[PDB]
Amino acid sequence: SLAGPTGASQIGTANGLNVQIALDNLRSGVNVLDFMTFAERAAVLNYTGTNDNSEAFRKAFATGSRQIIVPPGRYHVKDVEIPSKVKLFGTYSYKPYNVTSDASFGTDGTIIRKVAGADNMFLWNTACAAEGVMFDGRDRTSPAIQSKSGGKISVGFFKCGFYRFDRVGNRRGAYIGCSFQFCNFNQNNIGIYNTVDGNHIGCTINANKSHGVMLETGANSNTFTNCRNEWNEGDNWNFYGATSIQVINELCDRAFGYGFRISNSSVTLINVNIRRSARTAASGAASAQIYFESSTLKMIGVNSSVGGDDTGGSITEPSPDYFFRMAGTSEGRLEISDSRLTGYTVGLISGTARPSVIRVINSPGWEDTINEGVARISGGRPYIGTMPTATGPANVSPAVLGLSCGGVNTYDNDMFDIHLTIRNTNNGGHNGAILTVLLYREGGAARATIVRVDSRSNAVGEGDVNSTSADPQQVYQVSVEVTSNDASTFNLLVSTKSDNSASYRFRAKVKP
Amino acid sequence: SLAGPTGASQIGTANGLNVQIALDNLRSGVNVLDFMTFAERAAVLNYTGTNDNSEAFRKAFATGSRQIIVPPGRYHVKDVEIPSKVKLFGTYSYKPYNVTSDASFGTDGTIIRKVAGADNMFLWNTACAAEGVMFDGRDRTSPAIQSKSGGKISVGFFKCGFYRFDRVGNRRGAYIGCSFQFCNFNQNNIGIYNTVDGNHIGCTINANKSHGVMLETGANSNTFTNCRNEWNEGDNWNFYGATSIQVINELCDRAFGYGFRISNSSVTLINVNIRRSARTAASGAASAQIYFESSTLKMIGVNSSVGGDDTGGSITEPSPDYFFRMAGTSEGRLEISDSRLTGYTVGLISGTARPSVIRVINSPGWEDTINEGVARISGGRPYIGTMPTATGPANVSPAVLGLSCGGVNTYDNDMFDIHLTIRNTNNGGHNGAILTVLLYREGGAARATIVRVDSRSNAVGEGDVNSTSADPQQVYQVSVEVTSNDASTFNLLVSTKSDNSASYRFRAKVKP
Amino acid sequence: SLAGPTGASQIGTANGLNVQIALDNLRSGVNVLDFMTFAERAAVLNYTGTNDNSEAFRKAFATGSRQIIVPPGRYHVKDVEIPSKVKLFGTYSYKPYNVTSDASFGTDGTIIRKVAGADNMFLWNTACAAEGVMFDGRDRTSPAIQSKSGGKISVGFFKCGFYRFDRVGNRRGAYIGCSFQFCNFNQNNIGIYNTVDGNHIGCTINANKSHGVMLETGANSNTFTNCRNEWNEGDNWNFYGATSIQVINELCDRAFGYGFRISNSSVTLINVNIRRSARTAASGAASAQIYFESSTLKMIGVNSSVGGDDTGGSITEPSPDYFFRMAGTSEGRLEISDSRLTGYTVGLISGTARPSVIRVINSPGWEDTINEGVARISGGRPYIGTMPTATGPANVSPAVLGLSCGGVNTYDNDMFDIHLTIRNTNNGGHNGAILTVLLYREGGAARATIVRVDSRSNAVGEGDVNSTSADPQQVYQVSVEVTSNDASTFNLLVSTKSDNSASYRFRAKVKP
């Protein structure tokens, strides 16, 4: 009588409504354990047997409820598709830091495991999610977050832990538009795969086989506010064609080669603390902390250091030989500011390629260098415009050195100093000159006049050479004339006597 | 017998306590669905009918429990006041990104909706809160988080979603002391309203009608660590009298005019990526990315770019013409560092007003400029002190140019170089001079001596003019004397012959 | 019949499974209230009596479930050890901002209190955790998170509130490897104690008796992304031997002395807004905002200001007299960039000790200073190498001033300017010289030649003194020769006549 289907509804409660609706109100979503056999449910709650409990999940999904509650039991699923906008609610008590053996997990919280040699555990659809779930696939195959359809899928994981997966991403060649707010990526082959438009708050990347966090082309956009990278058995941060990326705060600890790899993707590192790197590397050309190539990289507060293992360990020597490894065609950009990038052993750069634009300011380990704009800096010494070198015979056509400047406004004037350096290629003698140049603009155009010229033994002078009245001490004649109407670009003309023919390699630098 | 009020307590359990207390322990707070009719509760759980279920909420509040549990059903409330320190616990499965139609919401999680043409849905009090709730008011009226009493109210929303509201704030003229840690502000008329002492962790501002995140006077203080602003149909970030504000990391995407507006509020942007802006604007004077006025603005890592819509779209041309639009009285402050603010089309500034203090360093698109301190920079060229221009007739009273310096200590000396520029206003001729000045202090006071003077044709000289022994080549007499006892401020006196009277516009610049 | 142990299982439900398993599936963990007497449980749910309910917790722990559910009732425990990997799940409705009296807590959420004069409430083990729990110990004794064994313990608290504790840490001398993601530390004696490898997301430190957040030696590592420090009755931030530490974003408000204290620990402050400090201090030498000693401190976006209490208050005058207080042996490092550190009243530094390395750039209130590298800055004026002072009699052994430079490559040349300053110690006269030096390297070695020398009255000259052909105006002979083979280091030799003997204090500065 009371043991039948309608038995529960026949017993009232103190509130005024019977037991059945009292139980119905307490649940937030449909419980998976409801669709389970007694022995199978007991095994799930006891963490003992595999039991391949995929039918419970299939029936829970077929119920049609957008909310699925997975209690702390241990599950084993096989190729069960998750319908759209379906979320899995789970509670965890302990998320293991390092899962070295199958017995790493204890009771802890909810665990969903792949069964036997299944090719997948879940086939995700758009707008799916999960909380408190520790996904685990025993084999390093079966990539996690694998969509049923080979297209971009937007999901989200608030607190979850992915273990022993090939990659947290679909089909090895497609992207997922997700943001792992607080997750733990451990013992995988790829810590994060091809996330697009992702905002990852506090993830943790532990020792992963292979690369770790790897992004490919198109996986444009991505922010990693406070992620931490542990001893990844591989490349750690790896970006190839990601248009954007920014790792904000947390450190990048020991990695087994190229703690950061940047190939064609613009990136920015705000406060990344790039610790030791390249534990397993070939020393020269492969022990650098950052492998920079053909891309734009910006750094604002990056710190670095060298060292060995924390304690014990097979390798104790300071691992990273260099800091930068540059290769490929030289067309990238590099901006550096306020970064204490002195962490290396033998050198700073391991290639003959350099970014087309360099902006390094206030960073120990690298003197200030700027290659663009009117005001540039070379080796810590500033100058204006360009430093042109003109080598050739300074007879019958005075050598021309094209200088640049900020410019002069109308009815305005400017003054500046030029360092002129002469290196006679034949004899080997050296000479120097300091001159002061004033640029003035009237209503029509601008003109340049040499205020003063000074040198050792009065070798250079504004007076014309090849003249009987010329001072015999003077060997070089220097003059200046403006090319552009804005006086921004002019040129210095240097000539010698008609009789002598020699190459001197004139160099003119405009000092502010 | 068992169907009465005391029926539940008469059936024991395996643990040792009967069913009634077993049910009482499982619940964390009082369930709202308990105070509902069968048909009304079924409609709530089925997302079908309006049913105007305000009495359930009123009775739940009148119960006196500080915790209110709202299951995933759909509700419709009307002007129900929430007592103090009362929190609404809800679970959501999917929070819509863009709610374009009434059928945007599906099953998803808990939804609380305004009913018919009610002027409000909730009247909040101090220390209220909510989790997992997607508040929705069909009409764009009825501002959310509207306090019953017209005063400041401190609330908090961990994970909630506000849709189609006039503003998330009370009475259109009062403030709320809240911090939206992880929220979604979509299709409102104002994304965030007058939050005071707020620390917003990871909010999301989607396409909102009107301004979006707008703060007014008094709403002093506010931090937006990782918020993201989508295509707001209006002003996007808008601050008027907020004393403080700092947007830390996330980007500011396309907005329909003045992606940032700053009127009288000091602000700071740490790593904001200000994307395209001013989709709907009047081009000149209204297409700038930031409308800066009469305030203090600081930037540390700001990035910018131009572009059109992602795909399709009515407008495809690069939207923002400029980067800065400055108007109003010029008394503000502007500090810029390490910001790649090259994102514009035609210009950089759209006004004749400039901040009183400018500190721009290492930012592409703007040469270094500093207006305060001893060491200043103009157009990338540094100098010390001030660059004074003195125009007038240099006869019978030598023209005086007041120069500044860091100072000289007791029994100490300093040397520096001065560039002197002369522009004869009548004839139009131009002349220049370089001189070296040494400042020395003895026990009593300091004095200045001119080490050297050099010019073209020896026009200037330290020798006295109007003397028969004077070199005829010399036309100008230059001298230096100290005014302050600290030698920090001195002046350069330039004089001409007694016979000639002309204005030259002398300019003296102290080059380090 | 139905009231016995097996009564619940005899009533079926609509789903197909009886009431007993229906109740068993709804619970996530073992409920503590299950192991309680009727009157004791009623008192717990009514927040009325102490009742010393430790046996319920002991039996719940002895059950063996890794998950413990604490409902919103008020508890009183005494020295109950928490087994490993055990988490306490609680729900809170209101976390008090300031607990001034015992009646500060109302109904609110789950509260666990220490009973009578117990020496502890919980004895934690490895991998323990808690959520939503407001721990409170009435006496300021009984440190929270006190491990049973005196060793490092790794725990974690997502959302918890610690009130009136001696310190959140074990045994006053040991460390805990935890990360308080979102916590509230109020009215304690120490806000945070000896956290190791901690990543604290959004903590809140309210008015705490004593220091507040204090770290000691070994508590190396720690990140405080968005913590906020309120009016701590003590030292606020206090680090002694912590190897690392970085406070990222949130402000540091009024503190009762040394808002930051750094003794031997390297630290970095990214965007800390250090407000007023030292409300209770001895003015001179104790009213500084930061007490810096013998350590490395870096700052990137730090802001500061002065002021009094918000309203009312006993003290209304601007509190912090200075900004820095430096003491102890001078061997530390200091890096400053883009920090508006103008917040003080009387001065900036309160000690005669300075860091060995200083790098201050683009920070108002302090002129640019750099002490390392080839390019240095003093008081906003740049130079290359070192500024040596050589005092002594310049007769029979010319005085030598060792200058440094970046260096010259093979078959390369460089030019630069040297400022030479002479202060005759006997008479008191002062003199200055400007000279231009060219360094050139041939195949073998490098050599230096003086391009030009200029001074007032031609006092200095490259010609040899003590020669009958020497110009009588020349008093000093200057020469330059290179010491290193790289021409990076050379020296300037200055000599006088043989007859005169006097000390001049020569100073040579290499201006870029």
Coordinates of N, CA and C in Angstrom, one line a residue, chain C residues 305-390:
Chain C
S305 N 49.3 59.0 -0.4 CA 48.6 60.3 -0.1 C 48.7 60.4 1.5
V306 N 48.3 61.6 2.0 CA 48.2 61.8 3.4 C 46.8 62.3 3.7
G307 N 46.5 62.2 5.0 CA 45.2 62.6 5.5 C 44.9 62.1 6.9
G308 N 43.8 62.5 7.4 CA 43.3 62.1 8.7 C 42.2 61.1 8.6
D309 N 41.4 61.0 9.7 CA 40.3 60.0 9.8 C 39.2 60.5 8.8
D310 N 38.4 59.5 8.4 CA 37.3 59.8 7.4 C 36.4 60.8 8.0
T311 N 35.8 60.6 9.2 CA 35.0 61.5 9.8 C 35.1 61.3 11.3
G312 N 34.8 62.4 12.1 CA 35.0 62.3 13.5 C 36.4 62.0 13.9
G313 N 36.6 61.0 14.7 CA 37.9 60.5 15.0 C 38.7 61.4 16.0
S314 N 39.6 60.8 16.8 CA 40.4 61.6 17.7 C 41.5 62.4 17.0
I315 N 42.0 61.8 16.0 CA 43.2 62.4 15.3 C 42.7 62.8 13.9
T316 N 42.9 64.1 13.5 CA 42.5 64.7 12.3 C 43.7 65.2 11.4
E317 N 44.9 65.4 12.0 CA 46.0 65.9 11.3 C 46.5 64.9 10.3
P318 N 47.2 65.4 9.2 CA 47.8 64.5 8.3 C 48.9 63.6 9.0
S319 N 48.7 62.3 9.0 CA 49.5 61.4 9.8 C 50.9 61.2 9.4
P320 N 51.2 60.7 8.2 CA 52.5 60.3 7.8 C 53.4 61.5 7.6
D321 N 54.5 61.7 8.4 CA 55.4 62.7 8.2 C 56.3 62.5 7.0
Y322 N 56.8 61.3 6.8 CA 57.7 60.9 5.7 C 57.1 59.8 4.9
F323 N 57.9 59.4 3.9 CA 57.5 58.2 3.1 C 58.4 57.0 3.3
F324 N 59.7 57.2 3.4 CA 60.7 56.1 3.7 C 61.4 56.3 5.0
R325 N 61.6 55.2 5.7 CA 62.4 55.2 6.9 C 63.5 54.1 6.7
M326 N 64.7 54.4 6.5 CA 65.8 53.5 6.2 C 66.7 53.4 7.4
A327 N 67.0 52.2 7.9 CA 67.9 52.0 9.0 C 68.7 50.7 8.8
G328 N 69.6 50.4 9.7 CA 70.4 49.3 9.6 C 71.6 49.4 8.6
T329 N 72.3 48.3 8.4 CA 73.4 48.4 7.4 C 72.9 48.6 6.0
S330 N 73.6 49.3 5.2 CA 73.2 49.7 3.9 C 73.7 48.7 2.9
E331 N 73.0 47.7 2.5 CA 73.4 46.7 1.5 C 72.2 46.3 0.6
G332 N 71.0 46.9 0.8 CA 69.8 46.5 0.1 C 69.8 47.1 -1.3
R333 N 68.7 46.8 -2.0 CA 68.4 47.3 -3.3 C 67.0 47.9 -3.4
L334 N 66.9 48.9 -4.3 CA 65.6 49.7 -4.4 C 65.4 50.0 -5.8
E335 N 64.3 49.5 -6.4 CA 63.9 49.8 -7.8 C 62.5 50.5 -7.7
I336 N 62.4 51.7 -8.4 CA 61.2 52.5 -8.4 C 60.9 52.9 -9.8
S337 N 59.6 52.8 -10.2 CA 59.2 53.2 -11.5 C 57.8 53.6 -11.5
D338 N 57.4 54.8 -12.1 CA 56.1 55.2 -12.4 C 55.2 55.2 -11.1
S339 N 55.8 55.6 -10.0 CA 55.1 55.7 -8.7 C 55.0 57.1 -8.3
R340 N 53.8 57.6 -8.0 CA 53.5 59.0 -7.6 C 53.6 59.0 -6.0
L341 N 54.9 58.9 -5.6 CA 55.2 58.8 -4.2 C 55.5 60.1 -3.5
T342 N 54.6 61.1 -3.7 CA 54.7 62.4 -3.2 C 53.9 62.5 -1.8
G343 N 53.4 61.4 -1.3 CA 52.6 61.5 -0.1 C 53.5 61.5 1.2
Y344 N 53.7 62.7 1.7 CA 54.4 62.9 3.0 C 54.1 64.3 3.4
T345 N 54.7 64.7 4.6 CA 54.5 66.0 5.1 C 55.8 66.8 5.3
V346 N 56.8 66.2 5.8 CA 58.1 67.0 6.1 C 59.2 66.5 5.3
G347 N 59.3 65.2 4.9 CA 60.4 64.7 4.2 C 60.1 63.4 3.5
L348 N 61.1 62.9 2.8 CA 61.0 61.6 2.0 C 61.7 60.5 2.6
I349 N 62.9 60.7 3.2 CA 63.7 59.6 3.8 C 64.1 60.1 5.2
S350 N 64.0 59.1 6.2 CA 64.3 59.4 7.6 C 65.5 58.7 8.1
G351 N 66.5 58.4 7.3 CA 67.7 57.7 7.7 C 68.9 58.1 6.9
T352 N 70.1 57.8 7.4 CA 71.3 58.1 6.7 C 71.8 56.9 5.9
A353 N 71.0 55.8 5.9 CA 71.3 54.6 5.1 C 70.6 54.6 3.8
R354 N 71.3 54.1 2.8 CA 70.7 54.1 1.4 C 70.9 52.7 0.8
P355 N 70.1 52.2 -0.1 CA 70.3 51.0 -0.7 C 71.6 51.0 -1.6
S356 N 72.3 49.9 -1.7 CA 73.5 49.8 -2.5 C 73.2 50.1 -3.9
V357 N 72.0 49.6 -4.4 CA 71.6 49.9 -5.8 C 70.3 50.6 -5.8
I358 N 70.2 51.7 -6.5 CA 69.0 52.5 -6.6 C 68.6 52.7 -8.1
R359 N 67.4 52.4 -8.4 CA 66.9 52.6 -9.8 C 65.5 53.3 -9.7
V360 N 65.5 54.6 -9.7 CA 64.3 55.4 -9.6 C 64.1 56.1 -10.9
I361 N 63.0 55.8 -11.6 CA 62.7 56.4 -12.9 C 61.2 56.8 -13.0
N362 N 61.0 58.1 -13.4 CA 59.6 58.6 -13.8 C 58.7 58.5 -12.6
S363 N 59.2 58.8 -11.4 CA 58.4 58.8 -10.2 C 58.4 60.2 -9.5
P364 N 57.3 60.9 -9.5 CA 57.2 62.2 -8.8 C 57.6 62.1 -7.4
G365 N 58.2 63.1 -6.9 CA 58.7 63.2 -5.5 C 60.2 62.7 -5.3
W366 N 60.7 62.1 -6.4 CA 62.1 61.7 -6.3 C 62.7 61.8 -7.7
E367 N 63.8 62.6 -7.9 CA 64.4 62.8 -9.1 C 65.1 61.5 -9.5
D368 N 65.3 61.3 -10.9 CA 65.8 60.0 -11.4 C 67.2 59.8 -10.8
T369 N 67.4 58.6 -10.3 CA 68.8 58.2 -9.8 C 69.0 56.7 -10.2
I370 N 70.2 56.5 -10.8 CA 70.6 55.1 -11.1 C 72.1 55.0 -10.7
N371 N 72.4 53.8 -10.1 CA 73.8 53.6 -9.5 C 74.5 52.5 -10.2
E372 N 73.9 51.8 -11.1 CA 74.5 50.6 -11.8 C 74.4 50.8 -13.3
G373 N 75.3 50.1 -14.0 CA 75.4 50.2 -15.4 C 76.2 51.3 -16.0
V374 N 76.4 51.3 -17.3 CA 77.2 52.3 -17.9 C 76.5 53.6 -17.9
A375 N 75.2 53.7 -18.2 CA 74.4 54.9 -18.2 C 73.8 55.1 -16.8
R376 N 74.2 56.1 -16.1 CA 73.6 56.4 -14.8 C 73.0 57.8 -14.8
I377 N 72.2 58.0 -13.8 CA 71.5 59.3 -13.7 C 71.7 59.8 -12.2
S378 N 72.0 61.1 -12.1 CA 72.1 61.7 -10.7 C 71.2 62.9 -10.7
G379 N 70.2 63.0 -9.9 CA 69.4 64.1 -9.7 C 68.7 64.6 -11.0
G380 N 68.4 63.6 -11.9 CA 67.8 63.9 -13.2 C 68.8 64.2 -14.3
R381 N 70.1 64.3 -14.0 CA 71.1 64.6 -15.0 C 71.8 63.3 -15.4
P382 N 71.8 62.8 -16.6 CA 72.5 61.6 -16.9 C 74.0 61.8 -17.1
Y383 N 74.7 60.6 -17.0 CA 76.1 60.6 -17.3 C 76.5 59.1 -17.6
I384 N 77.7 58.9 -18.0 CA 78.2 57.6 -18.3 C 79.4 57.2 -17.4
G385 N 79.3 56.0 -16.9 CA 80.4 55.6 -16.0 C 80.3 56.0 -14.6
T386 N 81.4 56.6 -14.1 CA 81.4 57.0 -12.7 C 81.9 58.5 -12.6
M387 N 81.5 59.1 -11.5 CA 81.9 60.5 -11.2 C 83.0 60.5 -10.1
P388 N 84.2 60.4 -10.4 CA 85.2 60.3 -9.3 C 85.7 61.7 -8.9
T389 N 86.0 61.8 -7.6 CA 86.5 63.0 -7.0 C 87.9 62.7 -6.5
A390 N 88.9 63.4 -7.0 CA 90.3 63.2 -6.6 C 90.8 64.5 -6.0

